[PDB]
Write a protein that binds this ligand. Structure first.
Ligand SMILES: Nc1ccccc1OC1CCOCC1
Length: 209
C-alpha cells in the first residue's frame, strides 16, 4: 500500500532549481547529509540525558557511508532520532517552505547553492547527484517507513518491509550515471576530510568486495 503526495509548490521549485542550475561544486551534498545525520544524533542524545530508555532501540550513535557500485547507490546511515510518518510527509522534518523562500532570496542576492544548509533545506542537495532518493526511517514513537522521490513533483510513503533498523535514518542515493565518482573510496574520504572533519560522531566508510 503506497501513498503518493504532491510536493508543496515551493519545494518543487527548490528541487527543480537544484536539478537544473549549472553548478559544478556538487560534492557538498555529502556534507549536508552528514550534518543532518549529526543533528539527528544530537537530538536522540539529548533525549537520552533524562530518559535512558530512549536508547533501548540502540545505544550506538554513529554514521555509516556505504557505497555499492553494483546498485550504483551511496547510502548514508545514522542511528539518530529518526522521523515519524508525519515528519516524513512534512518535508522530512524541515521548515522547507520558509527555508526555500530565504534560500532563493539569498541566491538572487549573491549566494550560491553550497550555502543551502544555512537555510535548513540541505537534504534536497541530494538531487545534485541522485536521480532518485529513498529515505528509510524509524523513530521510537512510530513504525518503520520508506519515503521516495525522483523529483517530478511527487513523493511516495509506504510502510517499510525491509531490514528493520532499530532507530535512525538511511538515505539511499540512486546516483546519476555521470556521478559515480562518489562511490570511489578515495573521493569519499577526500570529501569527508574536507567538509566534515569536526562532526562529533564516528563516520565509517565501508569498503566493497
Ligand atoms: N538524518 C536525516 C536524514 C534525512 C533527512 C533528514 C534528517 O534529519 C532530520 C532533521 C534532523 O533530525 C530529524 C530528521
Amino acid at each position: 500500500e503506497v501513498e503518493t503526495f504532491a510536493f508543496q509548490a515551493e519545494i518543487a521549485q527548490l528541487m527543480s532549481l537544484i536539478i537544473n542550475t549549472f553548478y559544478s561544486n556538487k560534492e557538498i551534498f555529502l556534507r549536508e547529509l552528514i550534518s543532518n545525520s549529526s543533528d539527528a544524533l544530537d537530538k536522540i542524545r539529548y533525549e537520552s540525558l533524562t530518559d535512558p530508555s530512549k536508547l533501548d532501540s540502540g545505544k550506538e550513535l554513529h554514521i555509516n557511508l556505504i557505497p555499492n557500485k553494483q546498485d550504483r547507490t551511496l547510502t548514508i546511515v545514522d542511528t539518530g532520532i529518526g522521523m515519524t510518518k508525519a515528519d516524513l510527509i512534512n518535508n522530512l522534518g524541515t521548515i522547507a517552505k520558509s527555508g526555500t523562500k530565504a534560500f532563493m532570496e539569498a541566491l538572487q542576492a549573491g549566494a550560491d547553492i553550497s550555502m543551502i544548509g544555512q537555510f535548513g533545506v540541505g537534504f534536497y542537495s541530494a538531487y545534485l547527484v541522485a536521480e532518485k532518493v529513498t529515505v528509510i526511517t524509524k523513530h521510537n514513537d512510530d513504525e518503520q517507513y520508506a519515503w521516495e522521490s525522483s523529483a517530478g513533483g511527487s513523493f511516495t510513503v509506504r510502510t517499510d518491509t525491509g531490514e528493520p533498523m532499530g532507530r535512525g535514518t538511511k538515505v539511499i542515493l540512486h546516483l546519476k550515471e555521470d556521478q559515480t565518482e562518489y562511490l570511489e573510496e578515495r573521493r569519499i574520504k577526500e570529501i569527508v576530510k574536507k567538509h566534515s572533519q569536526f562532526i562529533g560522531y564516528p563516520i565509517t566508510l565501508f569498503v566493497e568486495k
